[PDB]
Amino acid sequence: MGVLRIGHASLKVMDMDAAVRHYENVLGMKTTMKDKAGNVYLKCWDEWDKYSVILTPSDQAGMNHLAYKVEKEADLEALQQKIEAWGVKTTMLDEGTLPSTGRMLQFKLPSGHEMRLYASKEFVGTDVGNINPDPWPDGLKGAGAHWLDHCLLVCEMNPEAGINTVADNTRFVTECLDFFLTEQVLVGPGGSIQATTFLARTTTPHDIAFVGGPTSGLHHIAFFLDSWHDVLKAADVMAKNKVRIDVAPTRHGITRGETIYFFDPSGNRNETFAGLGYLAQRDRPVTTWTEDQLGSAIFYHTGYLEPSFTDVYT
Amino acid sequence: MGVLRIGHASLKVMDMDAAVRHYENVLGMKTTMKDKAGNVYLKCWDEWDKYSVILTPSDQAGMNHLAYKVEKEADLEALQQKIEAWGVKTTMLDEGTLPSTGRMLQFKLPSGHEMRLYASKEFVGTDVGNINPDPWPDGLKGAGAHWLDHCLLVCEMNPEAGINTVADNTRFVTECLDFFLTEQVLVGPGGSIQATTFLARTTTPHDIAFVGGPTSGLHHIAFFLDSWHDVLKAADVMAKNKVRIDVAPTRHGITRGETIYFFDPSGNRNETFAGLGYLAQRDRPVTTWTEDQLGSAIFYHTGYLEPSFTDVYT
Amino acid sequence: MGVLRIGHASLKVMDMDAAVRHYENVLGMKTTMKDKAGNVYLKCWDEWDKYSVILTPSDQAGMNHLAYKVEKEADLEALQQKIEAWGVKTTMLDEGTLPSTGRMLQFKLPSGHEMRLYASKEFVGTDVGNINPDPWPDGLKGAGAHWLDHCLLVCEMNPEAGINTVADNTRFVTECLDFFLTEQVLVGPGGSIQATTFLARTTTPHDIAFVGGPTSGLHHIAFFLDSWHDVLKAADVMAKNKVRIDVAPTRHGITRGETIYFFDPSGNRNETFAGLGYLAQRDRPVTTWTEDQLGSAIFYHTGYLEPSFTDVYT
Amino acid sequence: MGVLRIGHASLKVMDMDAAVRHYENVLGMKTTMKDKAGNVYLKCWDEWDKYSVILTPSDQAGMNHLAYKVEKEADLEALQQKIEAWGVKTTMLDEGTLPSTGRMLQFKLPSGHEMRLYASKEFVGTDVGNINPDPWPDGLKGAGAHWLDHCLLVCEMNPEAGINTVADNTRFVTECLDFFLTEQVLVGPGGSIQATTFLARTTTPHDIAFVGGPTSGLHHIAFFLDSWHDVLKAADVMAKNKVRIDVAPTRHGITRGETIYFFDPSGNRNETFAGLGYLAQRDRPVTTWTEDQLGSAIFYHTGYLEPSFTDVYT
Ligand SMILES: Oc1cccc(F)c1O
Ligand SMILES: Oc1cccc(F)c1O
Ligand SMILES: Oc1cccc(F)c1O
Ligand SMILES: Oc1cccc(F)c1O
Ligand SMILES: [Ca+2]
Ligand SMILES: [Ca+2]
Ligand SMILES: [Ca+2]
Ligand SMILES: [Ca+2]
Ligand SMILES: [Fe+3]
Ligand SMILES: [Fe+3]
Ligand SMILES: [Fe+3]
Ligand SMILES: [Fe+3]
């Protein structure tokens, strides 16, 4: 029972044509529908559900909500009960609130982000099929992202005022949603303050992550690539499409995953993440990164925490 | 609750010095202990428990038993109860039956293989540590296998006599151990016979697998590599060590994982498996491979099922 | 002055539609013209001359001739003079003998193969251009071969009758065409017999190569890929196109280049060759491979000389 | 006849212990001798001559001279004659001027750099040998650089005063040393000014290169790696050794080679260069990069010419 994986992310964009162009041509996603309000829904080739990205017209960037898929419909009642015993109030949006989407349990994380849980979303299949499938499909576009992998949320954090919603979110998704902590960044005196946490339901290093900030927001959504080579191809694609790069190809110290940071035309940050890294396990020790090695935890090859990683988000 | 991953495999070898030489120099494992009976225990660099491979002196090759680790000690009683309601009789070997190993629930699969479940094994840590760790350790040897990944068991199968322990094992580990089926090979009239199944507890394509055969036995144990490049390095290592190759570097149609098959000095087959392949999920459709494409399911690049894959095992 | 590189290879095929389909879809070549006799001319994306492959209608497989490009027109007279002082008779086919091709110096190697040298061939450019070019072009097809890299010729060899045209060809292209020997396979008593030689004009390990055989013929023509990863992609392409594989992805001991052997629909062997391997240099020692390690020289990962490598050619 | 490749580079360092530590541990070179004046000589594993790097004690960074190897001793007289007809005065340092080094023709490039040509240097062999060699050697250290690949020299350039030693060096090495131009960066009105040129004697994209600057100096020396994957490993090595990175892993638009820029402990810039890129050929069109795309020519993935690439050198 419980949460399976990240289901979709709903983003604000200011130019729909340019944004759809970006997620199709750069990341290789496909548009699957547009609702009557102008929202556009896209999926990756190696996902089987209708969509993992919602683009909504807006006058600003940022995130509307984040959705995770659960195994069965009955999980929603059980998780709703645990969430409310913890002190978080929930609502249940019914079927068709979002097109091709079943009912959704809705609530706010302690950091203030809206999170939804759904059990049912329209099946459409991967672009390779499930009867004698090819390992990859022809006509793949751009970086050819496999699937939406995880989301890093900036969480309001003010330790000298007793506010650390990174810690509160971490406690919340572990106790209520039964995520387990895989890696953490410890700052403050003797590493007494959790400033960044990575948590999983799958056996990958992270399906959700939180990083401290002056306010709450969206750091990035991430898409999976197979290998370091695909990261090279993806970087070649971003050059051909005049994409604005945040961080050039390098490796994360945390998770060991090779990565590129870049921006969509509205300013939301995207990541192409390469490799499993390691098999996340509930009996595995939590990987701890300390403040003196804070740079290598994010950008391992340089040990230099970019000013853009910690200052720029939507 | 429940099974986490494959825990260890206990193999028969006829030359201990040569076998230990093989798993250390070719796969990069490290010997962690030798018990009073001459059994040798080895682990991979990216595992944190004491051992994943047991080598036992013998006059033949083959497998003694297969062990999977569960999340907590109380899972053993719960799983024991389910297993026995299904019709399989169990025993509980207590702590220290194997050195550095907690109590073990022991039973036979329908195919006749001995399977054990344990919750407790001595922690020793990975060779990179868990405080500001490097992505890989210096002094890595041979192919530098990350961890024991899965095991493919040959299962007695005689359809015209009503015997298919591949199907019986598949039903057993799903109903009792709550594995889920990720991929299957269908043969016989219209694909009405399961001849090969791949099943998971992690979100990787397989942690156990069964393939039909005239008798039951061990097809191979497999070790994880990161990338296709590491497969090249591993093949270079096998050449330097005069390893007997079964199948040269290629890709599996099933799981999409890139692979090499080769033999230890006693004849047991090993595999170096590269890549995640895809994120296995309980809501993902089961990938079905048919008999006409049976060759591409195992050796995707040639479409040629090696006579050694289906005739040679221990 | 002198020879620059391999220029084109003219092959016999029995099904033109199927053969053109193969070189376009599998190797990623493009048809550039068809002459009035039905011959088809193809080039690779990273070549700038009109064509590197000629397909000619026939009732059998094999090679018509092999062509190398020289730096300037005046080289043809100088090389003609050296060739004839050596004892080989030459002719000069004038402009337009082949479409879009300048005059050609024609002669037979000691092994009997027809070889041509040309200075002039119509320029058409690479598919990426030469003003701010991309590293690779969009719409790349199949394996996306960069260029025709080299050709291995089977050369009549009967040592107990005093016939070794591998040695005679090797002496010929070194003394007359100023190739230099990079690697050799030595067989017979104490390695006293040259059975395979690799020779270069570029600073790559080989632009031409000779291997002994009961008769003279074509072993394969080869196309360059960048990386080991591209070899994986190429093998994936061959599976999608139901290509007949000779040797699955592995590494050559000679040259260190990673490779795949496979067949066109008429039976001619092709190779996708990955990597520089090393910088070939006139002051570099000749790499010598001995008969006991003859298997590793060709298929390094297995040490097993395929019966098809030494029995099957056209 | 003529120049074969870059032979060695002699660098100034301020801390010999730290510098030798860097070239051994980070790049994987080996110290082969130290002369009576404290100069240290190192080679790469895939070079066969005694050394390719000289470290000389100094109170500053920078380059002493640059040396290229020629095919035969008689080339030195012929090249000396051409060089002096051009207007450059030469001297001939005799055998043993440098240890294990034959006589050297010495002269200044128009940009003022000292250049030497030698025909003879002590042979010691590669670390894999030349009889049935492995593709790579065991005990490889750090990034495992194959060989010193090329050198980029900053050349005094003041167009509004009629000074462009990039153009003068380019004309010099082409007319006198018979290099050929492979790629150029064109700036100024309509691209009328050569600001960067890449020139070859091998069939690789460059063995020497010049870039304009306010003064003349050393931009970097470069070492060859096989693949994009080795660039990842090299970046992992630099992190483990706390190396100061200039540019994180990315691809060059020019040459198509994947690259990392970083510094030795004295401030000299090094590069780990991956891949052939393309086969450089005397009949290949010169790749032209324009000023509007000047950023992509150096750092292709971002299109952002680092301020450090054009401001920092020794
Ligand atoms: O995906 C990530 C893995 C490790 C560290 C990060 F900041 C990431 O975004
Ligand atoms: O690990 C494997 C994945 C797919 C097919 C197989 F036969 C395997 O051993
Ligand atoms: O391209 C080749 C390199 C080494 C050995 C061979 F047989 C080849 O075809
Ligand atoms: O090695 C190089 C290739 C292309 C451009 C550069 F700046 C280089 O250093
Ligand atoms: Ca994940
Ligand atoms: Ca697994
Ligand atoms: Ca070549
Ligand atoms: Ca070069
Ligand atoms: Fe991320
Ligand atoms: Fe396997
Ligand atoms: Fe070849
Ligand atoms: Fe460079």
Q: What is the DSSP string of B106-151?
A: EEE-TTS-EEEEES-B-B---TT-SBS--SS-TT--TT----EEEE
Is the CB of residue A70 less than 8 Å from the CB of residue A117?
yes
User: From CA B230, how far away is CA D46, in angstroms rounded?
Assistant: 21
Return the ligand number nearest the Cα of A221.
Answer: 9
Is the CB of residue D91 less than 8 Å from the CB of residue D62?
no
Strands C193-200 and C180-187: antiparallel
Phi, psi of B272, deg, nearest 5: -105, 115
User: From CA B182, how far away is CA B204, in angstroms rounded?
Assistant: 9
In the sheet with C3-13, reading across from the earlier edge strand, the strands are C30-34, C40-43, C53-57, C3-13, C62-70, C114-118, C104-108, C91-93
- Find, among C133, A270, A143, C130, the residue nearest to D296 by Cα: C133
User: From CA D138, how far away is CA D147, in angstroms rounded?
Assistant: 17
**Tokens 């604000």, located at residue:** A12
Select the CATH number that applies to the domain covering B1-146 from these four: 3.40.50.2020, 3.40.1350.10, 3.10.180.10, 3.10.580.10: 3.10.180.10
E strand or H helix that includes residue B309:
helix B307-311
CB atoms within 10 A of CB B149: 25
Q: Is A198 on the interface with B (CB under 8 A)?
A: no
Q: Encoding tokens for residue C311?
A: 């029995």
Distance between B143 CA and the closest CA of chain C, angstroms: 13
Bridge partner residues of C163 (DSSP)? C158
User: From CA A309, how far away is CA D57, in angstroms rounded?
Assistant: 40
Is the CB of residue D95 less than 8 Å from the CB of residue D102?
yes
DSSP annotation of B277 reads: -
Is the CB of residue A236 less than 8 Å from the CB of residue D258?
no
| Minimal Cβ distance to B227: which of D134, D138, D229 | D229
> What Rg, from alpha-carbon coordinates, does chain C have?
19
CB-CB neighbors (< 8 A) of D239 in chain B: 134
User: From CA D216, how far away is CA D314, in angstroms rounded?
Assistant: 9
Out of C8, C150, C258, C313, pick the active-site residue: C150
Bridge partner residues of B264 (DSSP)? none
CB-CB neighbors (< 8 A) of C257 in chain B: none
E strand or H helix that includes residue B279:
none
Is the CB of residue D144 less than 8 Å from the CB of residue D153?
no
Pocket test residue of D183, D211, D255, D304 for ligand 4, highest count of atoms within 8 A of CB? D255
Bridge partner residues of C164 (DSSP)? C157
Compute the Cα dihedral for C216, C217, C223, C227 and give only its sign: negative
Phi, psi of D241, deg, nearest 5: -100, 10
Triad B86, B91, B96: Cα angle to 5°: 145
CB-CB neighbors (< 8 A) of C236 in chain A: 134-136
Partner-chain contact D276 C276, CB within 8 Å: yes
D133 to B25, C207, C252, C267, D46: CA distances (angstroms): 19, 21, 11, 32, 11
User: From CA B165, how far away is CA B112, in angstroms rounded?
Assistant: 9
Q: Encoding tokens for residue A306?
A: 């970019």
User: From CA B288, how far away is CA A130, in angstroms rounded?
Assistant: 6
Would you call B293 exposed, middle or buried from its count of C-beta atoms within 10 A (0-12, 13-18, 19+)? middle
Phi, psi of D308, deg, nearest 5: -75, -30
Substitution target in A131, A185, A223 with the highest count of B β-carbons within 10 Å is: A131
D18 to B186, D10, D241, D265: CA distances (angstroms): 63, 16, 12, 6
Would you call D85 exposed, middle or buried from its count of C-beta atoms within 10 A (0-12, 13-18, 19+)? exposed
Indicate the Cα dihedral angle D246, D247, D248, D252, nearest 10°. Answer: -150
Which residue intervals of D36-115 are DSSP H helices? 73-86
Q: Which amino acid belongs to residue A131?
A: I
User: From CA C286, how far away is CA C186, in angstroms rounded?
Assistant: 12
Helix (H/G/I), strand (E/B), else coil: D214: coil
Strands A180-187 and C114-118: unpaired
Residues of B that are catalytic: 150, 206, 220, 252, 261, 271
Residues of D that are catalytic: 150, 206, 220, 252, 261, 271
Pocket test residue of B254, B299, B304, B313 for ligand 2, highest count of atoms within 8 A of CB? B254
**Tokens 């393939």, located at residue:** B211
User: From CA A250, how far away is CA B41, in angstroms rounded?
Assistant: 37
A188 to A215, A292, A293, A306: CA distances (angstroms): 19, 10, 13, 20
User: From CA B272, how far away is CA B238, in angstroms rounded?
Assistant: 11
Q: Encoding tokens for residue B193?
A: 């016979």
Q: Encoding tokens for residue A153?
A: 């949320």
Helix (H/G/I), strand (E/B), else coil: D305: coil
Return the ligand number nearest the Cα of D309.
Answer: 4
Bridge partner residues of C271 (DSSP)? C222, C261
Distance between C235 CA and the closest CA of chain B, angstroms: 5
Q: How far is the CA of B256 from the centre of ligand 10 (A)?
A: 11
CB atoms within 10 A of CB B158: 13
Q: Encoding tokens for residue D180?
A: 């050929």
Q: Which amino acid belongs to residue B86?
A: W
Q: How far is the CA of D206 from the centre of ligand 3 (A)?
A: 26
Strands C269-274 and C217-225: parallel
Helix (H/G/I), strand (E/B), else coil: D36: coil
**Tokens 């539609």, located at residue:** C17
Would you call B162 exposed, middle or buried from its count of C-beta atoms within 10 A (0-12, 13-18, 19+)? exposed
| Minimal Cβ distance to C229: which of A134, A138, A229 | A229
Q: Encoding tokens for residue C304?
A: 């097993």
Q: How far is the CA of B238 from the centre of ligand 7 (A)?
A: 28
Distance between A198 CA and the closest CA of chain C, angstroms: 30
E strand or H helix that includes residue D185:
strand D180-187
User: From CA D279, how far away is CA C146, in angstroms rounded?
Assistant: 10
CB atoms within 10 A of CB B304: 15
* Residues whose CB falls within 8 Å of the CB of residue B150, separated by 6 or more in sequence, listed in order: B6, B206, B207, B208, B209, B221, B222, B273
Domains of chain A, by residue range, sit at: 1-146, 147-314
Is the CB of residue C216 less than 8 Å from the CB of residue C155?
yes
CA–centroid distance for D91 within its chain: 23
Q: Encoding tokens for residue B17?
A: 């010095």
Helix (H/G/I), strand (E/B), else coil: B282: coil
Q: How far is the CA of A298 from the centre of ligand 1 (A)?
A: 6
Three-state SS for D77-92 is HHHHHHHHHHCCCCEE
Is the CB of residue D261 less than 8 Å from the CB of residue D269?
yes
- CA-nearest residue, atom 9 of ligand 2: B152
Is the CB of residue C173 less than 8 Å from the CB of residue C88?
no
Phi, psi of C285, deg, nearest 5: -60, 145
* Residues whose CB falls within 8 Å of the CB of residue A127, separated by 6 or more in sequence, listed in order: A30, A45, A46, A137, A140
User: From CA B106, how far away is CA B115, in angstroms rounded?
Assistant: 6
Partner-chain contact D245 A304, CB within 8 Å: yes
Is the CB of residue B165 less than 8 Å from the CB of residue B112?
yes
DSSP annotation of D256 reads: T
Phi, psi of A77, deg, nearest 5: -65, -45
Is the CB of residue B97 less than 8 Å from the CB of residue B104?
yes
CB atoms within 10 A of CB A87: 9
User: From CA A297, how far away is CA D313, in angstroms rounded?
Assistant: 29
User: From CA B252, how far away is CA B249, in angstroms rounded?
Assistant: 10
Q: Is B140 on the interface with D (CB under 8 A)?
A: no
Return the ligand number nearest the Cα of B183.
Answer: 2
Q: What's the farthest any 2 CA atoms get from each other in chain D?
A: 58
- CA-nearest residue, atom 4 of ligand 2: B254
Three-state SS for chain C is CCEEEEEEEEEEECCHHHHHHHHHHCCCCEEEEECCCCCEEEECCCCCECCCEEEEECCCCEEEEEEEEECCHHHHHHHHHHHHHHCCCCEEECCCCCCCECCEEEEECCCCCEEEEECCECECCCCCCCECCCCCCCCCCCCCCCCEEEEEEEEEEEHHHCEEHHHHHHHHHHHCCCCEEEEEEEECHHHCEEEEEEEECCCCCCCEEEEEECCCEEEEEEEEECCHHHHHHHHHHHHHCCCEEEEEEEECCCCCCEEEEEECCCCCEEEEEECCCCCCCCCCCCEEEEHHHHHHHHCCCCCCCCHHHHHCCC
User: From CA D132, how far away is CA D126, in angstroms rounded?
Assistant: 13
Strands A180-187 and A287-290: parallel
CB-CB neighbors (< 8 A) of C241 in chain A: none
CB atoms within 10 A of CB B220: 27
E strand or H helix that includes residue D279:
none
Percentage helix, strand, coil for chain B under 3-state DSSP, each rounded to 5: 20, 40, 40
CB atoms within 10 A of CB D77: 10
A1-146 against A147-314: fold identical: yes
D110 to C111, D107, D173: CA distances (angstroms): 51, 10, 10
Is the CB of residue B218 less than 8 Å from the CB of residue B314?
yes
CB atoms within 10 A of CB D93: 15
User: From CA D295, how far away is CA D293, in angstroms rounded?
Assistant: 5
Partner-chain contact D134 B229, CB within 8 Å: no
**Tokens 């098999």, located at residue:** A279
Half-sphere exposure of D185 (CA within 13 A, CB side): 23
Tell me the resolution in Å: 2.2
Phi, psi of D20, deg, nearest 5: -60, -40
Half-sphere exposure of B27 (CA within 13 A, CB side): 36
Strands D217-225 and D269-274: parallel
Query: How was this model experimentally determined?
Result: X-ray
Q: In chain A, which among 216-245 make CB contacts under 8 A with chain C?
A: 227, 229, 236, 239-240
Q: Which amino acid belongs to residue D73?
A: E
CB-CB neighbors (< 8 A) of B239 in chain D: 134
Q: Which amino acid belongs to residue B130?
A: N
Helix (H/G/I), strand (E/B), else coil: B162: coil
User: From CA B168, how far away is CA B89, in angstroms rounded?
Assistant: 15
Partner-chain contact B301 C258, CB within 8 Å: no
User: From CA D44, how far away is CA D53, in angstroms rounded?
Assistant: 9
User: From CA B136, how far away is CA B134, in angstroms rounded?
Assistant: 5
Residues of A that are catalytic: 150, 206, 220, 252, 261, 271
Asked whether A210 lines ligand 1 (CB < 6 A), one says no
DSSP annotation of B251 reads: E
Bridge partner residues of A290 (DSSP)? A186
Is the CB of residue D53 less than 8 Å from the CB of residue D65?
no
B92 to B97, B104, B173, C281: CA distances (angstroms): 10, 6, 18, 68
Three-state SS for chain A is CCEEEEEEEEEEECCHHHHHHHHHHCCCCEEEEECCCCCEEEECCCCCECCCEEEEECCCCEEEEEEEEECCHHHHHHHHHHHHHHCCCCEEECCCCCCCECCEEEEECCCCCEEEEECCECECCCCCCCECCCCCCCCCCCCCCCCEEEEEEEEEEEHHHCEEHHHHHHHHHHHCCCCEEEEEEEECHHHCEEEEEEEECCCCCCCEEEEEECCCEEEEEEEEECCHHHHHHHHHHHHHCCCEEEEEEEECCCCCCEEEEEECCCCCEEEEEECCCCCCCCCCCCEEEEHHHHHHHHCCCCCCCCHHHHHCCC
* Residues whose CB falls within 8 Å of the CB of residue B76, separated by 6 or more in sequence, listed in order: B70, B92, B103, B105, B117, B118, B119
Q: Encoding tokens for residue C105?
A: 């110096």
Partner-chain contact B46 A278, CB within 8 Å: yes
Q: Encoding tokens for residue D303?
A: 């299109």
Bridge partner residues of B154 (DSSP)? B211, B217
Asked whether A253 lines ligand 1 (CB < 6 A), one says no
Partner-chain contact B134 D227, CB within 8 Å: no
Asked whether A179 lines ligand 1 (CB < 6 A), one says no
Partner-chain contact B130 A297, CB within 8 Å: no
Is the CB of residue A179 less than 8 Å from the CB of residue A200?
yes
Domain D147-314 is found in CATH 3.10.180.10: yes
User: From CA D254, how far away is CA D67, in angstroms rounded?
Assistant: 24
CB atoms within 10 A of CB B311: 9
Is the CB of residue A106 less than 8 Å from the CB of residue A153?
no
E strand or H helix that includes residue D261:
strand D258-263
User: From CA A274, how far away is CA A236, in angstroms rounded?
Assistant: 15
CB-CB neighbors (< 8 A) of B5 in chain A: 203, 279, 281
Partner-chain contact B135 D229, CB within 8 Å: no
Put residue A80 in one of left, alpha, beta given phi > 0 → left and psi -120 to 50 → alpha. Answer: alpha
